[PDB]
Amino acid sequence: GNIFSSMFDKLWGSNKELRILILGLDGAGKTTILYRLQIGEVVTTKPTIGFNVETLSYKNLKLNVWDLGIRPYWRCYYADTAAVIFVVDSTDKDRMSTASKELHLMLQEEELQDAALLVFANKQDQPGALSASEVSKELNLVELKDRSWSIVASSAIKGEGITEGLDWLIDVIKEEQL
């Protein structure tokens, strides 16, 4: 998993530890992506009640993953947050609506004013999974303005799309830090 680490090494130098949030409705495959990286160490914690955050800590970076569906206990992480990776299950046209909501509430927070966005149209390997562009529409990512965003089709399970996406993200984050 060192290619991933080499990629994240490009964020070394930031004058403050950087934070990335992997979010989305449960089942979207966030955890999978997190474990996909195979770098640093991951530890689960329950800061508040009925709330569990999985945190991957890698030399100067923090990756936090928790399910959506906006209790203020979270506002705690938006401070140093550099970007959010929004994982969407492409084979769930139902909750697709809910997600779009949860995503905008999130992206509507003041501290995430500059966070870059990477959306993962995940589970593309599954039968009946909306295309990437189909999700960019269902989330109105088009309507989003004054913000670095991008969507990518993915099969976290087979690790398809993950690297291509993170690659993009990291560069944006790095740039923005400059």
Ligand X SMILES: Nc1nc2c(ncn2[C@@H]2O[C@H](COP(=O)(O)OP(=O)(O)O)[C@@H](O)[C@H]2O)c(=O)[nH]1
Among positions 64, 122, 136, 148, the unique one binding ligand X when judged by CB under 6 A: 122
State the minimum distance, in angstroms, from the CB of residue 174 to ligand X: 26
The yes or no reply on residue 31 touching ligand X (CB under 6 A) is yes
Q: Considering only the stretches 7-15, 30-38, 101-109, 136-144, report the one whose residues sit in contact with ligand X under the rule CB under 6 A.
A: 30-38
The residue sitting closest to ligand X, measured at its beta carbon, is: 29
CB of 143 to ligand X, least distance (A): 25
Q: H/E element holding 133?
A: helix 132-138
Q: Please, which residues have CB within 8 angstroms of residue 24's CB and are 6 or more apart in sequence?
A: 30, 67, 68, 86, 87, 88, 89, 99, 102, 103
- From residue 111, alpha-carbon distances to 1, 63, 117 in Å are 31, 17, 14
Backbone angles phi, psi at 168, to 5 degrees: -50, -60
SS (H, E, C) 2-23: HHHHHHHHHHCCCCCCEEEEEE
Query: Taking the complex as a whole, how short is the minimal distance between the CB of residue 93 and ligand X, in angstroms?
Result: 16
Residue 156 in the binding site for ligand X (CB under 6 A): yes
Q: Does 123 participate in binding ligand X (rule CB under 6 A)?
A: yes
Is 94 in a helix, a strand, or coil?
coil
79-94 burial code (b ≥16 CB/10 A, e <16): eebbbbbbbbbbebee
Annotated binding-site positions: 24-31, 67-69, 122-125
Binding segment for ligand X (CB under 6 A), chosen from 8-16, 102-110, 121-129, 163-171, is: 121-129
Output the smallest distance, CB 158 to ligand X, in A: 7
Query: Which residues bind to ligand X, rule: CB under 6 A?
Result: 26-32, 67, 87, 122-123, 125-126, 155-157
